[PDB]
Coordinates of C-alpha atoms and ligand atoms in Angstrom, one line a residue:
Chain A
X1 CA 0.0 0.2 0.0
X2 CA 1.3 3.2 1.2
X3 CA 4.9 3.6 2.6
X4 CA 4.2 0.1 4.1
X5 CA 4.9 -1.5 0.8
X6 CA 8.0 0.1 0.6
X7 CA 8.7 -1.3 4.0
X8 CA 7.7 -4.8 3.1
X9 CA 10.2 -5.0 0.5
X10 CA 13.2 -3.8 2.2
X11 CA 12.4 -6.1 5.2
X12 CA 11.9 -9.1 3.1
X13 CA 15.4 -9.2 2.1
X14 CA 16.9 -9.8 5.6
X15 CA 17.1 -13.2 6.9
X16 CA 14.8 -12.1 9.6
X17 CA 12.0 -14.5 11.0
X18 CA 9.4 -14.7 9.1
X19 CA 6.7 -13.9 12.0
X20 CA 8.9 -10.7 12.8
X21 CA 8.6 -9.4 9.2
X22 CA 4.7 -9.6 9.9
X23 CA 4.7 -8.0 13.6
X24 CA 7.2 -5.2 12.5
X25 CA 4.7 -4.0 9.5
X26 CA 1.7 -4.3 11.9
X27 CA 3.9 -1.9 14.4
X28 CA 4.3 0.3 11.2
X29 CA 0.8 0.5 10.3
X30 CA -0.4 1.2 13.9
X31 CA 2.0 4.0 14.0
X32 CA 0.5 5.2 10.7
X33 CA -2.6 5.1 11.9
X34 CA -2.6 6.3 15.6
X35 CA 0.4 8.6 15.3
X36 CA 0.5 10.4 11.8
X37 CA 0.4 8.8 8.4
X38 CA 3.7 7.3 7.4
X39 CA 5.5 9.3 4.5
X40 CA 8.1 7.1 2.0
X41 CA 10.3 9.5 4.0
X42 CA 10.7 8.2 7.6
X43 CA 9.3 4.6 7.1
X44 CA 13.1 3.5 7.1
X45 CA 13.1 5.3 10.4
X46 CA 10.4 3.8 12.0
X47 CA 11.1 0.5 10.5
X48 CA 14.9 0.5 12.0
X49 CA 13.6 2.1 14.9
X50 CA 11.3 -0.9 15.7
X51 CA 13.4 -3.9 14.6
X52 CA 15.9 -2.0 17.1
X53 CA 13.6 -1.8 19.8
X54 CA 13.5 -5.6 19.6
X55 CA 17.3 -6.0 20.3
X56 CA 18.8 -5.5 23.7
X57 CA 19.2 -2.0 24.8
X58 CA 21.9 -0.2 23.0
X59 CA 23.8 0.3 26.7
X60 CA 24.4 -3.4 26.4
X61 CA 26.5 -3.3 23.1
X62 CA 29.2 -1.4 24.7
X63 CA 31.0 -2.8 27.6
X64 CA 34.5 -2.6 25.6
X65 CA 37.5 -4.0 27.3
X66 CA 37.7 -3.4 31.1
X67 CA 37.9 -6.0 33.3
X68 CA 41.5 -7.7 34.1
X69 CA 40.2 -10.8 32.3
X70 CA 38.8 -11.4 29.0
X71 CA 37.4 -15.0 28.3
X72 CA 36.2 -15.8 24.9
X73 CA 34.3 -19.2 24.4
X74 CA 31.8 -21.3 22.2
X75 CA 31.6 -22.9 18.7
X76 CA 34.7 -24.7 17.2
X77 CA 36.4 -23.0 14.4
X78 CA 34.4 -19.8 14.7
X79 CA 37.4 -17.9 15.8
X80 CA 38.1 -17.5 19.4
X81 CA 41.8 -17.7 19.1
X82 CA 42.1 -15.7 15.9
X83 CA 39.8 -13.1 17.5
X84 CA 41.3 -12.8 20.8
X85 CA 44.9 -12.2 19.4
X86 CA 42.9 -9.1 17.6
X87 CA 41.5 -7.8 20.9
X88 CA 44.9 -8.0 22.7
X89 CA 46.9 -6.6 19.8
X90 CA 44.0 -3.7 19.9
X91 CA 44.4 -2.7 23.5
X92 CA 48.1 -2.7 23.1
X93 CA 48.0 0.0 20.1
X94 CA 44.8 1.6 21.2
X95 CA 45.4 1.4 24.7
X96 CA 49.3 0.6 25.3
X97 CA 48.0 -1.4 28.1
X98 CA 49.6 -4.6 29.4
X99 CA 48.8 -7.7 27.5
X100 CA 48.9 -11.3 29.2
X101 CA 47.8 -14.6 27.9
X102 CA 46.2 -17.7 29.5
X103 CA 45.2 -20.6 27.2
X104 CA 42.8 -23.2 28.6
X105 CA 42.8 -25.1 25.2
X106 CA 44.7 -27.9 26.9
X107 CA 43.8 -30.4 24.1
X108 CA 48.7 -29.2 19.1
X109 CA 46.0 -26.6 19.3
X110 CA 47.9 -24.5 21.4
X111 CA 51.2 -23.3 19.8
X112 CA 49.3 -21.1 17.4
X113 CA 49.0 -18.7 20.6
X114 CA 52.3 -18.9 21.8
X115 CA 53.9 -17.9 19.0
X116 CA 51.4 -14.7 18.6
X117 CA 51.8 -14.2 22.2
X118 CA 55.6 -14.0 21.3
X119 CA 55.4 -11.7 18.4
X120 CA 53.9 -9.1 20.9
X121 CA 56.2 -9.9 23.6
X122 CA 53.1 -11.0 25.8
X123 CA 53.4 -14.1 28.4
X124 CA 50.9 -16.7 28.3
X125 CA 50.4 -19.3 30.6
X126 CA 48.8 -22.7 29.4
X127 CA 46.5 -24.2 32.3
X128 CA 45.1 -27.9 32.5
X129 CA 43.3 -27.8 36.0
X130 CA 41.5 -24.9 37.7
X131 CA 44.2 -24.9 40.0
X132 CA 47.0 -24.1 37.3
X133 CA 44.7 -21.4 35.9
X134 CA 44.8 -19.8 39.6
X135 CA 48.3 -19.9 40.0
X136 CA 48.6 -18.2 36.9
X137 CA 46.4 -15.5 37.8
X138 CA 48.6 -14.5 40.7
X139 CA 51.2 -14.0 38.3
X140 CA 49.7 -11.5 36.4
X141 CA 48.4 -10.0 39.8
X142 CA 50.5 -7.0 38.1
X143 CA 48.9 -7.0 34.9
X144 CA 46.4 -4.6 32.9
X145 CA 44.5 -7.4 31.1
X146 CA 44.5 -11.1 30.6
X147 CA 43.2 -12.7 27.6
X148 CA 42.1 -16.1 28.2
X149 CA 41.7 -18.3 25.3
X150 CA 39.6 -21.5 25.7
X151 CA 39.3 -25.1 23.9
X152 CA 36.1 -25.3 21.6
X153 CA 33.9 -28.3 21.5
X154 CA 30.5 -29.2 21.1
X155 CA 28.8 -27.9 24.0
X156 CA 25.8 -30.0 23.4
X157 CA 27.5 -32.6 25.5
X158 CA 26.8 -31.1 28.9
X159 CA 30.4 -32.5 29.9
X160 CA 32.3 -29.5 28.1
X161 CA 30.3 -26.6 29.5
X162 CA 30.4 -27.5 33.2
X163 CA 33.7 -28.2 32.2
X164 CA 34.2 -24.9 31.1
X165 CA 32.7 -23.6 34.5
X166 CA 35.3 -25.6 36.4
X167 CA 38.6 -24.2 34.9
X168 CA 37.5 -20.7 34.3
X169 CA 35.3 -20.1 37.8
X170 CA 33.9 -16.8 36.7
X171 CA 34.9 -14.5 39.7
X172 CA 33.9 -10.8 39.7
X173 CA 36.7 -9.4 37.3
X174 CA 36.0 -11.4 34.2
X175 CA 34.4 -10.5 30.9
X176 CA 33.0 -13.5 29.0
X177 CA 32.2 -13.6 25.3
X178 CA 30.5 -16.0 23.5
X179 CA 32.1 -16.3 20.4
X180 CA 29.3 -17.3 17.6
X181 CA 30.0 -17.3 14.1
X182 CA 27.6 -15.3 11.9
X183 CA 27.7 -18.0 9.3
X184 CA 26.0 -20.2 11.8
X185 CA 22.5 -21.6 11.3
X186 CA 19.6 -20.1 13.3
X187 CA 18.3 -23.0 15.0
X188 CA 21.7 -24.2 15.9
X189 CA 22.6 -21.1 17.9
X190 CA 19.2 -21.2 19.2
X191 CA 20.2 -24.2 21.2
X192 CA 24.1 -23.4 22.1
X193 CA 22.8 -20.2 23.5
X194 CA 20.5 -22.2 25.7
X195 CA 23.5 -24.8 26.8
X196 CA 25.4 -21.6 27.8
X197 CA 22.5 -20.2 30.1
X198 CA 24.1 -21.8 33.1
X199 CA 27.3 -19.5 32.4
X200 CA 27.7 -16.0 32.5
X201 CA 28.4 -14.3 29.0
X202 CA 28.4 -10.7 29.2
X203 CA 28.6 -10.1 25.5
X204 CA 28.5 -11.9 22.1
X205 CA 30.7 -11.9 19.5
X206 CA 29.7 -12.7 16.1
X207 CA 32.4 -13.8 13.4
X208 CA 32.8 -13.9 9.9
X209 CA 30.2 -11.4 8.9
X210 CA 32.0 -11.2 5.7
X211 CA 31.2 -14.8 4.9
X212 CA 27.5 -15.0 5.2
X213 CA 25.1 -13.6 2.9
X214 CA 22.5 -12.5 5.5
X215 CA 22.5 -11.2 9.1
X216 CA 19.1 -12.5 9.3
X217 CA 19.6 -15.4 11.6
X218 CA 21.9 -13.3 14.0
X219 CA 19.2 -10.7 14.4
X220 CA 17.0 -13.1 15.3
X221 CA 19.0 -14.7 17.9
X222 CA 19.8 -11.2 19.3
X223 CA 16.1 -10.6 19.2
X224 CA 15.7 -13.2 21.9
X225 CA 18.0 -12.6 24.7
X226 CA 19.1 -10.1 27.0
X227 CA 22.9 -9.5 26.0
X228 CA 24.1 -7.4 22.8
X229 CA 27.4 -7.6 20.6
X230 CA 30.8 -6.6 21.8
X231 CA 32.4 -6.8 18.6
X232 CA 31.9 -8.3 15.2
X233 CA 34.7 -10.1 13.6
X234 CA 34.6 -9.5 9.7
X235 CA 37.9 -11.0 8.3
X236 CA 41.3 -12.7 8.9
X237 CA 43.6 -10.0 9.2
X238 CA 44.9 -9.3 12.5
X239 CA 44.3 -6.9 14.0
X240 CA 42.5 -4.8 11.4
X241 CA 39.5 -7.1 11.2
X242 CA 37.5 -6.5 14.2
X243 CA 34.7 -3.9 14.9
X244 CA 32.2 -2.8 17.4
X245 CA 28.4 -2.2 16.6
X246 CA 25.4 -0.6 18.0
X247 CA 21.7 -2.0 17.6
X248 CA 20.9 1.1 15.0
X249 CA 24.3 0.0 13.5
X250 CA 24.1 -3.7 13.3
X251 CA 20.3 -3.1 12.2
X252 CA 21.5 -0.8 9.3
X253 CA 23.8 -3.6 8.3
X254 CA 20.8 -5.8 8.2
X255 CA 18.8 -4.0 5.9
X256 CA 21.8 -4.8 3.5
Chain B
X1 CA -5.2 -38.0 5.0
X2 CA -4.2 -41.7 4.5
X3 CA -0.7 -42.6 4.7
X4 CA 0.0 -39.5 3.2
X5 CA -0.5 -37.3 6.6
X6 CA 1.9 -40.1 8.2
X7 CA 4.6 -38.6 5.6
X8 CA 3.9 -34.8 5.6
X9 CA 4.6 -35.2 9.6
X10 CA 7.8 -37.1 9.1
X11 CA 8.9 -34.9 6.3
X12 CA 8.2 -31.3 8.0
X13 CA 10.7 -32.5 10.6
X14 CA 13.8 -32.3 8.2
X15 CA 15.0 -29.0 7.4
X16 CA 14.2 -29.6 3.8
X17 CA 13.1 -26.9 1.9
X18 CA 9.6 -26.1 2.2
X19 CA 8.9 -26.4 -1.8
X20 CA 10.5 -30.1 -1.7
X21 CA 8.1 -30.8 1.0
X22 CA 5.4 -30.2 -1.2
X23 CA 6.6 -31.8 -4.3
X24 CA 7.5 -35.0 -2.2
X25 CA 4.0 -35.5 -1.0
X26 CA 2.8 -35.0 -4.6
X27 CA 4.8 -37.5 -5.9
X28 CA 3.7 -39.9 -2.9
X29 CA -0.1 -39.0 -3.9
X30 CA 0.7 -40.1 -7.6
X31 CA 2.4 -43.3 -6.2
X32 CA -0.7 -43.7 -4.3
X33 CA -2.8 -42.7 -7.0
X34 CA -1.4 -44.4 -10.4
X35 CA 0.3 -47.4 -8.7
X36 CA -1.5 -48.9 -5.8
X37 CA -2.9 -47.4 -2.8
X38 CA 0.1 -46.4 -0.4
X39 CA -0.4 -48.3 3.0
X40 CA 1.3 -46.7 6.3
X41 CA 3.8 -49.8 5.8
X42 CA 5.8 -48.5 2.7
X43 CA 5.2 -44.4 2.7
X44 CA 8.5 -44.4 4.6
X45 CA 9.7 -46.4 1.7
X46 CA 8.5 -44.4 -1.3
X47 CA 9.2 -41.2 0.8
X48 CA 13.1 -42.2 1.4
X49 CA 13.1 -43.4 -2.1
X50 CA 11.9 -40.1 -3.7
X51 CA 13.9 -38.0 -1.6
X52 CA 16.7 -40.1 -2.7
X53 CA 15.9 -39.8 -6.1
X54 CA 16.7 -36.2 -5.9
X55 CA 20.0 -36.8 -4.6
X56 CA 23.1 -37.5 -6.8
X57 CA 23.3 -41.1 -7.9
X58 CA 24.4 -43.5 -5.1
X59 CA 27.3 -44.5 -7.5
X60 CA 28.6 -40.7 -6.7
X61 CA 28.8 -41.2 -2.9
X62 CA 31.5 -44.0 -3.2
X63 CA 35.0 -43.5 -4.9
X64 CA 37.0 -43.7 -1.7
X65 CA 40.6 -42.9 -1.4
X66 CA 42.0 -44.2 -5.1
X67 CA 44.3 -41.7 -6.4
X68 CA 47.8 -40.6 -5.7
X69 CA 46.7 -37.3 -4.5
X70 CA 44.0 -36.1 -1.9
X71 CA 43.0 -32.5 -1.8
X72 CA 40.6 -30.9 0.5
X73 CA 39.6 -27.1 0.3
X74 CA 37.0 -24.8 1.6
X75 CA 35.3 -23.0 4.4
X76 CA 37.3 -21.6 7.2
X77 CA 37.2 -23.7 10.4
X78 CA 35.1 -26.3 8.9
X79 CA 37.7 -29.0 9.4
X80 CA 40.3 -29.4 6.3
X81 CA 43.2 -30.1 8.4
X82 CA 41.7 -32.3 11.0
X83 CA 39.6 -34.1 8.4
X84 CA 42.6 -34.6 6.2
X85 CA 44.7 -36.2 9.3
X86 CA 41.7 -38.8 9.8
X87 CA 41.8 -39.9 6.3
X88 CA 45.7 -40.3 6.1
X89 CA 45.4 -42.3 9.4
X90 CA 42.6 -44.4 8.0
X91 CA 44.5 -45.4 5.0
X92 CA 47.6 -46.4 7.0
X93 CA 45.8 -48.8 9.5
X94 CA 42.6 -49.8 7.0
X95 CA 45.2 -50.0 4.3
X96 CA 48.7 -49.8 5.2
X97 CA 49.8 -47.6 2.4
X98 CA 52.2 -45.1 2.2
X99 CA 51.1 -41.6 3.9
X100 CA 52.6 -38.3 2.4
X101 CA 51.7 -34.6 3.2
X102 CA 51.6 -31.3 1.2
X103 CA 50.3 -28.5 2.7
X104 CA 49.7 -25.3 0.8
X105 CA 48.7 -23.6 3.7
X106 CA 51.5 -21.1 3.5
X107 CA 49.8 -17.9 5.5
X108 CA 51.4 -20.4 12.3
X109 CA 48.7 -22.1 10.9
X110 CA 51.0 -24.8 9.6
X111 CA 52.6 -26.3 12.6
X112 CA 49.4 -28.4 13.7
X113 CA 50.0 -30.6 10.6
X114 CA 53.8 -31.2 10.8
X115 CA 53.7 -32.4 14.2
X116 CA 50.7 -34.5 13.3
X117 CA 52.7 -35.9 10.1
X118 CA 55.5 -36.5 12.7
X119 CA 53.1 -38.7 15.2
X120 CA 52.7 -41.0 12.1
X121 CA 55.9 -40.6 10.7
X122 CA 55.2 -39.3 7.4
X123 CA 56.9 -36.7 5.3
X124 CA 55.0 -33.1 4.9
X125 CA 56.2 -30.7 2.2
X126 CA 54.9 -26.8 2.8
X127 CA 54.6 -25.2 -0.7
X128 CA 54.1 -21.5 -1.5
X129 CA 54.2 -21.4 -5.2
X130 CA 52.7 -23.9 -7.8
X131 CA 56.3 -24.5 -8.5
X132 CA 57.0 -25.8 -5.0
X133 CA 54.2 -27.9 -5.0
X134 CA 55.5 -29.5 -8.2
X135 CA 58.9 -30.3 -6.7
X136 CA 57.3 -31.8 -3.6
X137 CA 55.1 -34.4 -5.7
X138 CA 58.3 -35.6 -7.7
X139 CA 59.8 -36.5 -3.9
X140 CA 56.8 -38.8 -3.5
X141 CA 56.9 -40.1 -7.0
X142 CA 57.5 -43.4 -5.0
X143 CA 54.7 -42.7 -2.6
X144 CA 51.1 -44.3 -2.0
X145 CA 48.8 -41.2 -1.1
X146 CA 49.7 -37.6 -1.0
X147 CA 47.3 -35.9 1.2
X148 CA 47.2 -32.0 0.4
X149 CA 46.0 -29.7 2.7
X150 CA 44.9 -26.2 1.7
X151 CA 44.8 -22.9 3.5
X152 CA 41.0 -21.8 4.0
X153 CA 39.5 -18.1 3.5
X154 CA 36.6 -16.2 2.0
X155 CA 36.3 -17.7 -1.5
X156 CA 33.9 -15.2 -2.1
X157 CA 36.8 -12.9 -3.3
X158 CA 37.5 -14.4 -6.8
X159 CA 41.2 -13.9 -5.8
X160 CA 41.2 -17.1 -3.6
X161 CA 39.5 -19.1 -5.7
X162 CA 42.1 -18.8 -8.9
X163 CA 44.7 -18.8 -6.4
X164 CA 43.6 -22.2 -5.1
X165 CA 43.8 -23.4 -9.0
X166 CA 47.2 -21.8 -9.3
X167 CA 48.9 -23.9 -6.6
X168 CA 47.2 -27.1 -6.9
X169 CA 46.9 -27.3 -10.9
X170 CA 44.2 -30.4 -11.1
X171 CA 46.1 -33.1 -13.3
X172 CA 44.6 -36.4 -14.0
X173 CA 45.8 -38.0 -10.8
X174 CA 44.1 -35.9 -7.9
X175 CA 40.9 -36.3 -5.9
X176 CA 39.1 -32.9 -4.7
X177 CA 36.9 -32.7 -1.8
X178 CA 35.0 -29.6 -1.2
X179 CA 34.7 -29.5 2.8
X180 CA 31.7 -27.8 3.9
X181 CA 30.4 -27.7 7.6
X182 CA 26.9 -29.2 7.9
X183 CA 26.8 -26.5 10.5
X184 CA 26.6 -24.0 7.3
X185 CA 23.6 -22.0 6.5
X186 CA 21.8 -23.2 3.0
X187 CA 21.9 -19.7 1.3
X188 CA 25.4 -19.4 2.1
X189 CA 26.7 -22.9 0.8
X190 CA 24.5 -22.2 -2.2
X191 CA 26.9 -19.2 -3.4
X192 CA 30.4 -20.8 -2.2
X193 CA 29.3 -24.0 -4.1
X194 CA 29.0 -21.7 -7.0
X195 CA 32.1 -19.8 -6.5
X196 CA 33.6 -23.6 -6.9
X197 CA 32.3 -24.5 -10.1
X198 CA 35.1 -23.2 -11.7
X199 CA 37.2 -26.2 -9.9
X200 CA 37.0 -29.7 -10.2
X201 CA 35.4 -30.8 -6.8
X202 CA 34.9 -34.9 -7.3
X203 CA 33.2 -35.0 -3.9
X204 CA 31.8 -33.1 -1.0
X205 CA 32.6 -33.8 2.8
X206 CA 30.2 -32.3 5.4
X207 CA 31.6 -32.0 8.7
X208 CA 30.3 -31.7 12.1
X209 CA 27.0 -33.6 11.4
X210 CA 27.2 -33.7 15.5
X211 CA 26.8 -30.0 15.8
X212 CA 23.8 -28.9 13.4
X213 CA 20.4 -29.5 14.7
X214 CA 19.0 -30.6 11.3
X215 CA 20.7 -32.0 8.4
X216 CA 17.9 -30.4 6.3
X217 CA 20.2 -27.6 4.5
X218 CA 22.9 -30.3 3.6
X219 CA 20.4 -32.0 1.6
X220 CA 19.0 -28.7 0.3
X221 CA 22.4 -28.4 -1.1
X222 CA 23.1 -31.9 -2.3
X223 CA 19.7 -31.9 -4.0
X224 CA 20.6 -29.5 -6.7
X225 CA 24.3 -30.6 -7.8
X226 CA 25.9 -33.6 -9.5
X227 CA 28.4 -34.7 -6.9
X228 CA 27.7 -36.9 -3.5
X229 CA 29.6 -37.0 0.0
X230 CA 32.6 -39.2 0.2
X231 CA 32.8 -38.7 4.1
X232 CA 30.9 -37.2 6.8
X233 CA 32.9 -36.1 9.8
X234 CA 30.8 -36.2 13.0
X235 CA 33.6 -35.5 15.9
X236 CA 37.0 -34.3 16.9
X237 CA 38.5 -37.5 17.6
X238 CA 41.2 -38.8 15.2
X239 CA 40.7 -41.0 13.4
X240 CA 37.4 -42.3 15.0
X241 CA 35.2 -39.7 14.0
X242 CA 34.9 -39.9 10.1
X243 CA 32.2 -42.1 8.2
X244 CA 31.0 -42.5 4.5
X245 CA 27.3 -42.4 3.7
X246 CA 25.0 -43.5 0.8
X247 CA 22.2 -41.5 -0.6
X248 CA 19.5 -44.0 1.0
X249 CA 21.7 -43.7 4.4
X250 CA 22.1 -39.9 4.2
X251 CA 18.3 -40.0 3.7
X252 CA 17.9 -42.0 6.6
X253 CA 19.9 -39.8 8.7
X254 CA 17.9 -36.8 7.5
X255 CA 14.7 -38.2 8.5
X256 CA 16.0 -37.8 12.2
Ligands
GTP1 N1 36.1 -14.9 6.7 C1 36.7 -14.9 8.1 N2 37.3 -16.0 8.6 C2 37.5 -15.6 9.8 C3 37.2 -14.7 10.6 N3 37.5 -14.8 11.8 C4 38.3 -16.1 11.8 N4 38.3 -16.7 10.6 C5 39.1 -17.6 9.9 O1 38.4 -18.9 10.6 C6 39.5 -19.8 11.1 C7 39.4 -20.4 12.3 O2 39.7 -19.4 13.4 P1 40.1 -19.8 14.5 O3 40.4 -18.6 15.3 O4 41.3 -20.6 14.7 O5 38.9 -20.6 15.4 P2 38.7 -21.1 16.8 O6 37.3 -20.7 17.1 O7 39.8 -20.5 17.7 O8 38.5 -22.4 16.7 P3 38.9 -24.0 17.6 O9 40.2 -23.4 18.6 O10 38.9 -25.1 16.9 O11 37.5 -23.8 18.4 C8 40.6 -19.3 10.4 O12 41.0 -19.4 9.0 C9 40.7 -18.0 10.7 O13 41.4 -17.1 10.0 C10 36.5 -13.9 10.2 O14 36.0 -12.9 10.7 N5 36.3 -13.9 8.5
GTP2 N1 32.1 -30.9 16.9 C1 33.0 -31.0 15.7 N2 34.1 -30.7 15.6 C2 34.9 -30.6 14.5 C3 34.7 -31.4 13.5 N3 35.8 -31.6 12.6 C4 36.6 -30.6 13.1 N4 36.1 -30.2 14.4 C5 36.7 -28.9 15.2 O1 36.7 -27.8 14.5 C6 37.8 -26.9 14.7 C7 38.6 -26.5 13.5 O2 38.8 -27.8 12.7 P1 40.1 -27.6 11.7 O3 40.6 -28.7 11.1 O4 41.3 -26.8 12.2 O5 39.4 -26.4 10.5 P2 40.1 -26.1 9.2 O6 39.0 -26.3 8.1 O7 41.5 -26.7 8.7 O8 40.5 -24.8 9.6 P3 41.3 -23.7 8.4 O9 42.7 -24.3 8.2 O10 41.1 -22.2 9.4 O11 40.5 -23.1 7.2 C8 38.6 -27.9 15.6 O12 38.3 -27.5 17.1 C9 38.3 -29.3 15.2 O13 38.8 -30.4 16.1 C10 33.4 -32.2 13.5 O14 33.1 -33.2 12.8 N5 32.5 -32.2 14.7
MG3 MG1 41.1 -21.6 19.1
MG4 MG1 43.3 -26.0 8.2

């Protein structure tokens, strides 16, 4: 119909959940109806404003590196290590702070980070038991930020999730990022998000936004949980390919 | 209605493309109609038989390791290396043949395979230019199978795909497997499959079937290309977690 047809088109292109498309149009029609006729001028404004109103508050998409400990975990291959290396590098040139590493990736899959840690002249401590990961903290009792890379598996198995909670206890001075790949399938993230309810993820980290066709799926998830994204990884180059997004921002990215 | 309602239910559970569900039911109704009333006995037989008839011929899901050269490539993080290590190991205990390695993963991301290659007492040759990868072949001019791991990127960039075709020329004695993650999104695989048309993939390799909720998406792809799957990777343990599937098999796995 009116600017409502301009919206439907735009919205349909996003991988967004079929229902959501519907609702959002209704919310527009309603504004149109009980506010003041929608003009083909600010449709894309209410549209983005609405979709925006579904995602967590914009104040939950910031909290950049702050705690002495940064912990990344989640999905195999998504980019926990590569991303961690970026963040560290970032806060070493965009903050000059003291970088420190701790890898929990006990189970070959660990020489990657030692060399990187080396290229930046930063110490890394490999830790097997919750005990070891504790001794390692005191060592950096006088360090700025300590990036903790963790081994990745199929958190479907309840064993790997509690094991995660055993090695990395989660005290008051720790930032947890559940690193998921924008490449990921919606009904798949739906479950893993759930399996991680028992653990305190402060923020998400959607990677490979440069590989997935649509960013629909990722909105679908976000639009049903309380924490926003802290960074979005869009490439392999380190440390250039990382970025931070805001609800409006992410949404603008979503509308293609 | 008749056993047609028993089918619809079953089919709807698979992540299979919405259209396909429809068509398949029609094909059933038709059998029902012009063949001999469908009984709630062989519905799941025609059902699997039909879905089966959409996927490539069953003779295109076999061709196990045969050529002197095995090349795996595709999607970042999907499991090219981990899988390659499995295959080699396999053909060393399930065939005693001579294992050989060549890594094209020039651009840290390479010490993983040297140690593994070491644990099996097998030689690996790292190769930068098409020239180097050629010198390496002659070295194993007297070797059984040579597994070639390749670096992974965003084959969206046309640069990485032709570069793949430059280092690994693709002569008559080579087996190419496009390693995709069952974890992957359908419209995403749709494109990468395309970007790889210029290169000769003999077989697919869907990994992480143990991580994705549905296997719908993966059928969706297969049901629109000419080559079947050669192995399916369902875990991290090496070399236990690999398997081979057949259309009927894969389909039976699909119906949950
Ligand atoms: N296209 C693209 N590739 C990425 C991105 N982030 C990481 N990668 C690549 O994905 C692959 C795996 O990255 P890793 O960082 O090793 O993945 P991980 O989560 O630590 O992997 P595990 O330790 O096995 O759980 C590498 O080839 C990375 O360079 C991204 O934003 N975009
Ligand atoms: N759950 C599960 N994890 C797997 C499977 N195959 C591989 N992985 C894990 O996924 C991660 C990445 O595997 P890799 O083999 O390094 O991936 P890759 O394709 O060589 O990665 P790049 O070289 O970065 O392109 C590792 O943690 C693997 O152990 C699988 O079938 N299931
Ligand atoms: Mg890692
Ligand atoms: Mg690899």
